Each structure stands twice: as structure tokens, then as C-alpha cells.
Amino acid sequence: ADQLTEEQIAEFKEAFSLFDKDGDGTITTKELGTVMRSLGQNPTEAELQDMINEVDADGNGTIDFPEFLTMMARKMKDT
Numbered sequence: 001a002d003q004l005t006e007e008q009i010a011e012f013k014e015a016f017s018l019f020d021k022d023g024d025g026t027i028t029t030k031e032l033g034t035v036m037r038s039l040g041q042n043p044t045e046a047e048l049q050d051m052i053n054e055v056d057a058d059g060n061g062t063i064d065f066p067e068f069l070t071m072m073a074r075k076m077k078d079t
Contacts, residue, residue, distance in 0.1 A: 003073065015039050016065065025065045029056055032063060047075065 004012070019027045019035045027035065029052050036043070051074075055067040 012039075012069075016068070020065070022062075026062045027068070029061050029063055032068070035068075043075065051075070 002009075015035055015038055016027070018038070019031055022028075032052060033048060051071040052063075055063055055071065
């Protein structure tokens with residue numbers, strides 16, 4: 001299940017909404033670094049490339065909404 005407070009989801013929606021202007025909820029991997037920067041997050045370039053190559057398995061250059069959300073959960077020290 002989600003491990004994010006419901007109020008945080010409102011902000012997360014507005015950040016993704018400004019970039020998923022493609023119309024069905026997809027963002028490009030070239031702007032992938034930009035959405036996280038708008039949210040105030042700057043991870044290592046090594047992590048940036050790795051989180052992209054795990055989900056962009058078909059190399060289509062697009063990332064769907066739940067994939068990006070999974071990666072944002074996966075980078076923490078879980079319990």
C-alpha cells in the first residue's frame with residue numbers, strides 16, 4: 001500500500017500534472033530529471049540513470065505514472 005500521507009498526494013499530483021501534458025498520463029524520460037527537481041529532489045546521476053533503465057525496458061522513452069511513483073518509493077531505506 002502507499003506509505004505517503006494523503007496531503008502529500010495533492011502536491012505530487014500538481015507536479016506530475018504540469019509535465020504529463022501528453023494527454024494520457026505519460027512523461028518523457030528527458031524531463032524525468034526536471035519533475036524531481038521541481039519537487040526539490042536531486043539524487044546521484046548514477047541513481048537517475050538506473051531508475052530510468054529499469055522501467056524503460058522497451059526503450060520507448062516514456063514513463064507511465066505508476067512507474068515513476070514506484071521509483072519514488074524504492075529509493076528510500078524501507079523497513
